[PDB]
Amino acid sequence: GEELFTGVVPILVELDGDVNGHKFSVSGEGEGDATYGKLTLKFICTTGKLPVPWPTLVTTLTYGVQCFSRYPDHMKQHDFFKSAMPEGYVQEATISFKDDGNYKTRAEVKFEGDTLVNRIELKGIDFKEDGNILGHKLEYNYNSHNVYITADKQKNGIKANFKIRHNIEDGSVQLADHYQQNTPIGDGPVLLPDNHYLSTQSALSKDPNEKRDHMVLLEFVTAAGI
């Protein structure tokens, strides 16, 4: 499980979304290096313009690559994500935006050959047209935050929760809560962790030679708390 992440592993992310009557698709490619908890990815909207801002989709597009988190040696027995590989896990997440709508997501994370794949489906409901999301009022950045993980022994998986603070153009913040649940696909044994967190930091950029709606992401994820 942990053995498949000793080097640089290619990543494939495919998302099919539906936010307020607007159907879209995002294709992501890149590489992950778990030894340094480094993720370099390029996301492209293949259906045209993204109906929502790119920062709102960061958690949806990256919660599936939490397997590239650097777990310090003394914490390695708490790495659920890598232990479920190659068969992987089915994950679900609800991203609730304060005073606005919510994203209901489901993803299948597994190895397809020597490549880590994320097949995601998103359903965005009850969003205000005058809101920060559909009104595209959010800044093109993503703050550093923690991802709190706890074990779910009944379903042989984990649960993850954290608060997101999206930066609005006027200087204010748009709050959001991400509640995640992971359950293994295969019949093999997984590592059930004690309470800990993943310290994340992200840099959002653009490819100067790209005309399609896109997002280039550099992300560092490190486990801590124990």
From Swiss-Prot:
Outcome following mutation: E219G: Suppresses the 399 nm excitation peak, leaving only the longer wavelength peak at 475 nm
Outcome of mutating Y142C: In mut1.9; shifts fluorescence lifetime from 3.03 to 2.74 ns
Result after altering Y142F: In Sapphire/H9-40; exhibits a huge Stoke's shift, with an excitation peak at 399 nm and an emission peak at 511 nm. In Azurite; shifts the excitation and emission spectra to shorter wavelengths and increases quantum yields compared to BFP
GO biological process, one term: bioluminescence
One Pfam family named in its UniProt record: GFP
Effect of H145D: In Cerulean; leads to improved quantum yield, a higher extinction coefficient and is 2.5-fold brighter than ECFP
Keyword match Disulfide bond: no
(Z)-2,3-didehydrotyrosine sites (modified residues): Y63
Record location of the 5-imidazolinone (Ser-Gly) cross-link: T62-G64
Outcome of mutating V221R: In Azurite; shifts the excitation and emission spectra to shorter wavelengths and increases quantum yields compared to BFP
Keyword set, alphabetical order: Chromophore, Luminescence, Photoprotein
PTM (free text): Contains a chromophore consisting of modified amino acid residues. Maturation of the chromophore requires nothing other than molecular oxygen.
Family: Belongs to the GFP family.
Function of the protein: Energy-transfer acceptor. Its role is to transduce the blue chemiluminescence of the protein aequorin into green fluorescent light by energy transfer. Fluoresces in vivo upon receiving energy from the Ca(2+)-activated photoprotein aequorin.
Protein known as: Green fluorescent protein
Organism of origin: Aequorea victoria
Lineage of origin: Eukaryota, Metazoa, Cnidaria, Hydrozoa, Hydroidolina
